[PDB]
Amino acid sequence: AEKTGIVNVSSSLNVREGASTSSKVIGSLSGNTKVTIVGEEGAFYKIEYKGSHGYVAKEYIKDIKDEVLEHHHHHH
């Protein structure tokens, strides 16, 4: 069951490849941007980053709810 967390920042959210507060930044994501979570580890959530696995703190994650959107958007 995949989970989507809503990003909440005053400017932007940094993405780390490790799990520490200052491990290694590989890029950043826009605010209110949804992130897919496949698991959790420590005080940080694991997400599927394009090219590898991104790690972010739970503090920048708010309102976590499932939302995979049913297939076939076109309504019969």
Method by which the model was determined: NMR
Q: Which domain holds residue 7?
A: 1-76
Enumerate the β-bridge partners of residue 5. 35, 64
Q: Which has the closest alpha carbon to 35: 22, 25, 47, 20?
A: 47
Instruction: Tally the domains of the chain.
Output: 1
Q: Which has the closest alpha carbon to 34: 61, 11, 58, 53?
A: 61
* CATH (domain of 53): 2.30.30.40
CB neighbours of 11 closer than 8 A, spacing ≥ 6? 31
